[PDB]
Each structure stands twice: as C-alpha cells, then as structure tokens.
C-alpha cells in the first residue's frame, strides 16, 4: 500500500514521478490530502494526459478505500 513514507515515492511507484514537482507545488504533500483528490485536482496540479489522470485517479481510489478500512 504504503510502501511509501511519501507522496513522491508513491508517484514514483506508479511511474508518475514526472508530476511530483506539480503535486508538491499544489499542497498535495501527504497521503491524507492526496487520497481526497478528485479529477478536478488532478487537472489543476496539471495532469493533462488521459492515461495519467486515470492511472492516478484509480490509485488514489485504492489508497482512499484502503485508508477507510483501517479508519
């Protein structure tokens, strides 16, 4: 899940490291907030490629659902 003490690691794990710069500079610096990100947020941090938006959004959805189990 959390094999990443950090958001940069996670983005790296899902091969989306190219966005760390974007994510950081937008305040999405923890999994707490990241896991609440919606498509809108993904667009704002500037993710414009359809495949990336998806890969990311879907990872976030797994992240969020998992966090929710361990409330």
Curated annotation (Swiss-Prot):
Domain SAM per the UniProt entry, residue ranges: 2-66
Top-level taxon of origin: Eukaryota
> What is the protein name for this chain?
EphB2/CTF2
Q: What organism is the protein native to?
A: Homo sapiens
Taxon lineage: Eukaryota, Metazoa, Chordata, Craniata, Vertebrata
**Span of the full-length protein shown?**
912 to 982 of 1055
């Amino acid at each position: 899940y959390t094999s990443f003490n950090t958001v940069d690691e996670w983005l790296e794990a899902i091969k989306m490291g190219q966005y760390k710069e974007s994510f950081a500079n937008a305040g999405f610096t923890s999994f707490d907030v990241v896991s609440q990100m919606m498509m809108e947020d993904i667009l704002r941090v500037g993710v414009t490629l359809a495949g990336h938006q998806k890969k990311i959004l879907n990872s976030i959805q797994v992240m969020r659902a998992q966090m929710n189990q361990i409330q």
